[PDB]
Amino acid sequence: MKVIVLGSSHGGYEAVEELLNLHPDAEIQWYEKGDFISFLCCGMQLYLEGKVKDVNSVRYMTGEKMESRGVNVFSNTEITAIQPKEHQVTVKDLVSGEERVENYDKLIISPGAVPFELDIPGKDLDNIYLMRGRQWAIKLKQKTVDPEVNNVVVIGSGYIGIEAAEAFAKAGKKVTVIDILDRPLGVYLDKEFTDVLTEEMEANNITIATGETVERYEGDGRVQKVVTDKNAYDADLVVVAVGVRPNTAWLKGTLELHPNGLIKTDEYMRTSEPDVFAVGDATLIKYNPADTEVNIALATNARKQGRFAVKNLEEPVKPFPGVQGSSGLAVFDYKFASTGINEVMAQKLGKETKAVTVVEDYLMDFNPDKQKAWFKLVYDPETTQILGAQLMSKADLTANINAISLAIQAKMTIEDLAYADFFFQPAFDKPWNIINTAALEAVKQER
Numbered sequence: 001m002k003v004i005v006l007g008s009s010h011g012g013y014e015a016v017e018e019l020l021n022l023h024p025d026a027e028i029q030w031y032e033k034g035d036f037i038s039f040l041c042c043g044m045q046l047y048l049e050g051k052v053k054d055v056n057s058v059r060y061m062t063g064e065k066m067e068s069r070g071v072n073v074f075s076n077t078e079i080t081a082i083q084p085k086e087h088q089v090t091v092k093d094l095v096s097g098e099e100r101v102e103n104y105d106k107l108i109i110s111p112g113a114v115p116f117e118l119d120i121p122g123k124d125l126d127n128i129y130l131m132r133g134r135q136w137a138i139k140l141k142q143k144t145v146d147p148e149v150n151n152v153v154v155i156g157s158g159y160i161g162i163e164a165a166e167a168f169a170k171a172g173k174k175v176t177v178i179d180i181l182d183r184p185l186g187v188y189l190d191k192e193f194t195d196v197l198t199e200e201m202e203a204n205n206i207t208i209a210t211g212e213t214v215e216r217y218e219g220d221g222r223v224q225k226v227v228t229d230k231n232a233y234d235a236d237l238v239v240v241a242v243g244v245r246p247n248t249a250w251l252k253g254t255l256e257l258h259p260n261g262l263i264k265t266d267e268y269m270r271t272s273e274p275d276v277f278a279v280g281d282a283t284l285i286k287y288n289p290a291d292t293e294v295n296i297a298l299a300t301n302a303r304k305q306g307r308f309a310v311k312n313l314e315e316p317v318k319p320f321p322g323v324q325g326s327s328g329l330a331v332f333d334y335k336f337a338s339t340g341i342n343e344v345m346a347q348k349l350g351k352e353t354k355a356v357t358v359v360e361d362y363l364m365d366f367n368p369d370k371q372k373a374w375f376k377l378v379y380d381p382e383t384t385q386i387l388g389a390q391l392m393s394k395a396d397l398t399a400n401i402n403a404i405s406l407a408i409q410a411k412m413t414i415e416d417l418a419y420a421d422f423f424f425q426p427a428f429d430k431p432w433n434i435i436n437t438a439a440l441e442a443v444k445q446e447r
């Protein structure tokens with residue numbers, strides 16, 4: 001069986017891993033149009049902040065290693081087109097220009113996504129950067145120590161934008177974050193959490209300008225100003241982290257796409273065409289909190305879908321179990337994590353929820369290491385099943401969100417979590433830990 005896998009990032013890499021242990025016998029070709037195999041974009045912040053000194057170590061696989069395992073790795077080779085009926089792909093070697101057609105028995109593609117740009121006047125004056133991949137990581141890092149960069153503007157206040165804003169604020173630059181949305185990180189966290197994080201960011205001279213539409217970049221050769229409908233901001237560097245587009249235009253006419261460019265797949269990762277599977281950022285994934293398919297562009301999702309594509313290679317035998325959307329990140333001293341439905345998700349999906357928020361010290365009063373922690377539990381008003389949770393503290397309590405993710409998947413209720421057995425020891429927590437306490441509050445609210 002000859003299987004071709006497109007993409008060496010999270011979704012394609014795990015399909016190769018699961019092929020190696022489920023079909024050791026197969027002839028496996030792994031294609032990557034880029035120069036570098038399996039660079040970890042998730043580690044870009046640690047590199048920009050100087051935690052990791054070598055950009056080339058921010059990866060999780062090399063072509064050499066995979067070749068030792070019998071995989072044929074083709075870097076700098078792009079799959080240009082798929083001919084699904086005759087089961088062929090045309091590939092182009094980017095260093096020699098040579099094209100060739102390759103046949104396959106099964107094809108698994110994980111084409112990913114590309115940074116969304118603002119097509120506006122000034123569009124590319126110099127020093128308007130993006131944040132995806134090795135080359136952008138290297139260029140961003142050079143700007144961190146450049147004495148000419150004093151003001152950086154990042155457009156977009158989501159996860160990637162706040163990572164870039166933190167990295168340049170720590171490098172000693174003045175940062176403004178501009179977005180049309182009214183709260184930073186709103187997709188991940190509710191208002192009582194983002195109010196705290198906004199104050200923390202402003203304390204580290206990050207100005208957050210929300211509710212502003214960027215109209216044009218101005219400058220002589222290189223950017224000098226970002227002007228919005230409401231204001232103009234000096235900028236020596238702009239990082240655009242507004243969002244991402246699926247890398248699927250080359251597939252229009254070959255595979256069925258959704259109106260937004262996402263590849264249509266079923267629960268076995270199959271596309272509209274026989275023997276081609278699609279995984280990762282370019283697809284929708286079963287979202288268990290709301291029993292629907294949502295696009296959740298996370299490394300965790302692409303890795304699991306990658307393995308489930310191989311499980312269903314010969315037969316639709318293993319439906320995807322679904323995910324909850326779990327994410328976590330540190331923003332200066334605060335470490336937060338969240339899963340399931342929050343305010344922005346409930347609005348988008350049209351879902352009614354109830355919630356309790358507990359803000360108190362997570363250790364008992366006599367313990368000098370006690371610190372405040374915020375926990376919000378979101379549940380279904382009718383069944384009281386758990387729908388989501390968010391937590392934050394300068395102490396790392398994020399591993400507790402892993403239990404809430406399982407609780408949503410298991411359809412547990414606030415009563416189940418109120419009396420769930422979580423260990424107690426006074427150097428670690430209170431007799432009713434952070435999850436029990438919030439669920440105990442929800443039980444009182446529904447009495």
Ligand SMILES: Cc1cc2nc3c(=O)[nH]c(=O)nc-3n(C[C@H](O)[C@H](O)[C@H](O)COP(=O)(O)OP(=O)(O)OC[C@H]3O[C@@H](n4cnc5c(N)ncnc54)[C@H](O)[C@@H]3O)c2cc1C
Pocket residue numbers: 006007008009010011012031032033034041042043044077078079080110111112113114131132133160247279280281282297298299300301302
């Ligand atoms: C700055 C940043 C931080 C992030 N942090 C986190 C995090 O902390 N945790 C988390 O879970 N997620 C995080 N993510 C998201 C995560 O990186 C993505 O969800 C994941 O990389 C998606 O994997 P993918 O395989 O679908 O696509 P991509 O990573 O987009 O990779 C697609 C690959 O396929 C290649 N390719 C595309 N088309 C072709 C072609 N036609 N021929 C040959 N090769 C091709 C591309 O070169 C690329 O290497 C972050 C993303 C960014 C940008």
